[model samples]
Target: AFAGVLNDADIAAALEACKAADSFNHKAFFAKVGLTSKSADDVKKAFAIIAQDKSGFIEEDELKLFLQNFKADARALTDGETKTFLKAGDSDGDGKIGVDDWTALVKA
Candidate 1:
């Protein structure tokens, strides 16, 4: 589905080639293309080909949409119990729990 955004088979092929060169570690490949972090895998799988091209920057809107979708998907992965626990850790009740909360929750 996300692969369709590239709209170019050759570009997709090139991305695949890059993934292969990087041994299918999408995170590392994205980093080489100047994208970093744990979410790189999600971005790679979502954008596929275009992500491999460092020369071709992703549109601002597209990147934002991609990240929004990615975050929603990740949040969805949390079980109901985990969600409740995470929510409880939102000390300020801002609806966004940070890594500190996560670490504390984990330790607890």
Candidate 2:
């Protein structure tokens, strides 16, 4: 799981973009679950499950691609807050994320 505190506003904005893009089969389900109104705790729990067995670490370029794929607002994704989110996902507490961290995510 991507272990990090996510900004509620950022997450909400991301979700809205995902919905608009028809990004996943579960989009409707997420909508019904009140994605926008979800509490921070709830959002974290959900992401933990979804991101399980997957690296929280993403290259800056990769993250940029992901944000673009989801049609997220460029400004929001590049903002300091988003950088902080990515930083928190480096589970080993390293200043940077790498293959080892990705391996840890696979194991998680």
TM-score (all chains, Cα) for each model: 0.24, 0.31
**Tens digit of per-residue lDDT, candidate 2, span 5-108:** 34545555545654433242223323433443555555545444344236554554453333433233532244343354446446777644455543343233
Over 1-108, each residue of candidate 1 has an lDDT whose tens digit, in order, gives 344422344334434443321133323323443333324344444444423335333332233222223223321212433344435545556554444433333233
Q: Total clashing residue pairs per candidate?
A: 0, 0
Among the numbered candidates, top lDDT falls to 2
Q: List the residue pairs that clash in candidate 2.
A: none
Per-residue error (Å), model 1, residue 59:
23
Sliding window of 10 residues with minimal summed lDDT for model 1:
69-78
Model 1 misplacement above 4 A: 1-79
CA lDDT of each candidate? 0.36, 0.43
